[PDB]
Design a protein around this ligand. Structure first.
Ligand SMILES: OC[C@H]1O[C@H](O[C@H]2[C@H](O)[C@@H](O)[C@@H](O[C@H]3[C@H](O)[C@@H](O)[C@@H](O)O[C@@H]3CO)O[C@@H]2CO)[C@H](O)[C@@H](O)[C@@H]1O
Ligand SMILES: OC[C@H]1O[C@H](O[C@H]2[C@H](O)[C@@H](O)[C@@H](O[C@H]3[C@H](O)[C@@H](O)[C@@H](O)O[C@@H]3CO)O[C@@H]2CO)[C@H](O)[C@@H](O)[C@@H]1O
Ligand SMILES: [Ca+2]
Ligand SMILES: [Ca+2]
Lengths: 588, 588
């Protein structure tokens, strides 16, 4: 066997507590190298303390191969142990029939393994629910809608910025444009969101800031006055909740704007500022050389987001900054009852801070949802003591690459399988899946205005374990290249809206909320059935939902399903290129 | 190449912060499968934000193969980055000359890799010193001596337990014997410890408890009155410090004794006890069926250490228990100035508690030493936010197995290499190495009274990266099987002491403190030079210390060293079986 390809990391996503008496254990092996894996497991102390002749290693548990990423296979088993202490090792057999035991002490022939010594084994020493990962159940039933508030609806011309342009969804916005969108506009169109079927709103930043995007915060404790005021924000959250819609705000804690009181004080007083150590200033006075790009300087004497001199990095190791940020985080939850925080640039703030943030939020609301914006693998923030989930950019990015280019279905399934095996099972169901946002090109533009392709991408994404989100205007087919062109004014003129796509999105949201979300602890299966042909299955003990996606260049015939949920061809048996068909069937 | 054998886990012992601008990065590969590894690394944002044509991936950094465990090879490189943000990927070339890039996105041909996309890469997103592992420098210079206080010296007959036996180092103690050892006895023999050269004392538990070992605590806030009182303990710590000797106490926080006020209250009041939720009680009244073994019950209705009904497990998730234990931990440090805590059964207490414990201790004493007693791999407690180190049972156990049985030198070197690559480099230098203790058989008994073999084991262990400890009486050749026979009264009668071994131990302690501890960031090298023949090298930029160990059945000839530090044969060139020779030489 390929022993270098076998690995178990104790106390990780490969060995974790599910409830007071139950753990999940995983093993990695080299792809198709290992034929079977059994777990030897039980209470460590039982071996030499109990008077019985029976020993826990005499009764193996079979592990199941659950996924492969093309390089490795992943095996899993659930174990229950009333004594809430577990010692375990793996019996691995390769394709030639060579069996070894793999433990914390390495690889052995069974005959050479010291199976009576509790210290031979890997350990889950005591099952600690205080240390475990917990998923808030309400997220399961959510479909999110992301609003960039400057561009969703102008409900009040009287708060418009100077220079506001006429509302025109066909514009190509510049970086510094204003169109006057605000909180009253969101309130005015809650009916649209309820009719679409969404159950969560994700807002980009709404606190006082000079820009149209408001990531360069001036005051975290004030709704930007071009958007509204505290009374109006409270009204919006209550109106959303009345409609069964949760609210997630954007926390921009990595950096502050340079027009904040704190940064202006540093500019006035230099190192004698009370805020000097709230930042990362290498040389005083804090300075930079301007360039023709507002958002770039080569030589700022302080750390910044990216290279922009207008977003000085906050020193979140400073206890005064920790207290300031936790008071902000607490204020919006306690006073306005929001349901979730989306954490901007979350990876660049330290774990010590995020553990304090987690503890503060869960003390206010045990079912709070904490979503980190991170584009790369995020294991260290998803143990159970920091975030609930991250933006799932790597997962939706792989889906986009498959549909928009010509890679094999095997490649896509390998990438998705790799992603799922990075994290605990419950974590995977909390990941936030969006195919576009205020920082990437729009779906309809990536698809070159091929609506069938757009529908395929959305449907495939809405079948995945994580929770889906719709970026405002996707439901009407809005186009746009990357920022700022992905921030067009929302299309409210019916003559400019794709009504067929809107009808489709209503149906797809209902499949997600009424069928997918109501399975009970389901299994997902990825089957490559042909060249660029994928069968996706989700199934519990009662119900199987199946989606077939034909993204090759030939027609595909499938058996006529008895209960079709959603399809794009008029046929009940034929899929043309880029067609799909979703159906449901009882499990036999 | 064996791609299934290649792995990098970001934000772990494979990618960690050393100081504000510097990180260490490791890669695992299959043994001898990969010929070279280069790191491509730099500021993620530089790729698209800087106006220069130069890109960080155009200038690779070579990684060095530092260790192999017989299954995998491990590669390492240190990276400095003034922007304190790092994106990185690995260029790996196998034995056939096939080169691929390995990143957070998987394996690629270089030509297919999206090297201009910061999200292609693994990430160290911002270098957070608040999250890093820190090693206290003073531990570097320490040699510990472990005292089991009931058995070290009776300095006061007036506090002896009823039934105390005459002091006789030739006895085989029973489980419930008392010999009257106490704190005044330790004070009385500090001269012996200073003459031996030790610089740290590790005490087994000293707080009020009914047993001879005192792991069944009755009151954590009181020195056991058969050992002494608070005034005497303060005197002992001050006298130890005056001699340059640090003090480590044993914290028994997993379980309490059944004669504690808290457990007795549970027995009196059942679930109406104010302490009911300080424990893990499944059924009230808390009960068990006694057996002929005091330390065993099959059916206790509450969780216990092992299966002993006299050590109910504490519920360290309960905030009242957390506060109680942190107040104990703080009291002995603040009021008596101890230097370290050794944590009994540390793995069975939750990480949430240990993070609070760490924060409390470091707030009192930034250089505090926190040592966990854990027999299995301990990665999750050694990140930098919980313990400093653990008891290094797996490492010294491998050394014992080599010297006492007949395995190959390759096997030993593989096991030690595996251990070192589990942890950060600084952590490895904080691990606590003892070849015996109050829970295992004595060295001289394991060696079947072969003093040359005992000397070999001690010398080999004292050359390792971790800090060494001597269990009381090792320096005079005390014998003993496992507990209780490893707890004989200390041998103070000169006619019964091995004076040659004592002289040897003085010399070995001086080699450790005057030579090994004073190298500056050294490299350790393990060379297998023959059948059961090992050359161990430690070297910095000025000094190399070399030890050769001949544990085969033939004579071994070595070149005459110019500066021999320690040897067992009278020859300066010949090692007989079980001889060793340590020397020092300048690096050329
Ligand atoms: O002026 C700089 C920039 O500010 C705003 O960008 C924010 C993004 O909108 C937000 O989603 C987040 O994105 C960054 C990721 O966190 C980071 O890891 C890396 O991938 O870059 C992303 C894009 O910059 O954070 C930024 C900063 O708060 C504003 O929306 C942009 O128009 C503007 O260019
Ligand atoms: O009455 C039970 C037992 O109590 C005392 O044993 C302690 C050991 O001395 C101490 O070092 C520690 O050892 C345990 C390890 O933590 C645990 O992981 C596993 O390896 O078992 C070890 C040995 O029991 O803890 C125990 C309990 O506090 C006492 O010294 C013994 O004589 C007595 O048998
Ligand atoms: Ca407006
Ligand atoms: Ca005494």
């Amino acid at each position: 066997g390929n022993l270098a390809g076998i690995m178990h990391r104790p106390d990780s996503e490969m060995a974790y507590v599910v409830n007071e008496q139950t753990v999940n254990i995983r093993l990695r092996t080299a792809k198709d190298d290992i034929v079977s894996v059994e777990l030897l497991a039980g209470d460590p102390y039982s071996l030499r303390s109990l008077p019985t002749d029976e020993k826990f290693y005499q009764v193996p548990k079979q592990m199941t191969k659950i996924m492969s990423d093309g390089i490795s296979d992943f095996w899993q088993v659930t174990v229950t142990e009333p004594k809430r202490r577990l010692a375990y090792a793996f019996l691995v057999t390769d394709m030639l029939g060579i069996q070894k035991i793999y433990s914390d002490k390495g690889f052995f022939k069974v005959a050479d393994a010291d199976l009576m010594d509790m210290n031979f084994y890997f350990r889950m020493p005591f099952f600690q629910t205080i240390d475990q990962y917990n998923a808030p159940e309400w997220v399961t039933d959510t479909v999110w809608y992301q609003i960039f508030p400057e561009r969703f609806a102008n409900g009040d011309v009287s708060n418009d910025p100077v220079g506001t342009k006429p509302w025109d969804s066909t514009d190509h916005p510049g970086r510094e444009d204003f169109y006057g969108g605000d909180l009253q506009g969101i309130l005015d169109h809650l009916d649209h969101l309820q009719e679409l079927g969404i159950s969560g709103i994700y807002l980009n930043p709404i606190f006082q800031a000079p820009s149209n995007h408001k990531y360069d915060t001036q005051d975290y404790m004030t709704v930007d006055p071009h958007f509204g005021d505290a009374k109006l924000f409270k009204q919006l959250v209550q109106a959303a909740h009345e409609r069964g819609i949760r609210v997630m705000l954007d926390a921009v804690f990595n950096h502050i704007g340079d027009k904040s009181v704190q940064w202006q004080d540093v500019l006035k007083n230099e190192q004698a500022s009370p805020y000097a150590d709230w930042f990362h200033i290498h040389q005083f006075p804090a300075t930079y050389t301007p360039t023709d790009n507002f958002e770039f300087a080569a030589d700022a004497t302080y750390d910044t987001f990216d290279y922009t001199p207008h977003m000085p990095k906050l020193n979140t190791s400073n206890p005064e900054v920790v207290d300031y940020l936790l008071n902000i985080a607490t204020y919006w939850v306690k006073e306005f009852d929001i349901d979730a925080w989306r954490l901007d640039v979350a990876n660049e703030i330290d774990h010590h801070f995020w553990r304090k943030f987690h503890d503060a939020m869960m003390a206010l609301k045990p079912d709070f949802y904490i979503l980190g914006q991170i584009w790369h693998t995020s294991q260290s923030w998803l143990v159970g003591d920091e975030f609930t989930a991250v933006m799932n950019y790597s997962y939706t990015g792989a889906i986009l690459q498959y549909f928009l280019e010509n890679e094999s279905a095997d490649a896509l399934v390998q990438k998705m399988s790799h992603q799922l095996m990075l994290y605990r099972d419950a974590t995977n169901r909390m990941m936030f899946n969006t195919v576009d946002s205020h920082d990437t090109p729009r779906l309809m533009t990536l698809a070159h205005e091929d609506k069938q392709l757009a529908k395929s991408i959305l449907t495939f994404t809405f079948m995945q374990p994580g929770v889906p989100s719709i970026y405002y205007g996707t439901e009407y087919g809005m186009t746009g290249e990357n920022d700022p062109d992905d921030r067009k004014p929302m299309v409210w003129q019916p003559e400019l809206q794709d009504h067929d796509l809107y009808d489709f999105m209503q149906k797809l949201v209902q499949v997600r909320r009424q069928v997918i979300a109501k399975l009970s602890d389901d299994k997902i299966i990825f089957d490559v059935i042909g060249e660029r042909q994928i069968r996706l299955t989700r199934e519990d003990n009662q119900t199987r939902i199946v989606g077939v996606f034909n993204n090759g260049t030939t027609d595909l015939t499938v058996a006529q399903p008895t209960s079709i949920l959603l399809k794009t061809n008029q046929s009940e048996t034929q899929l043309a290129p880029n067609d799909f068909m979703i159906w449901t069937e009882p499990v036999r």
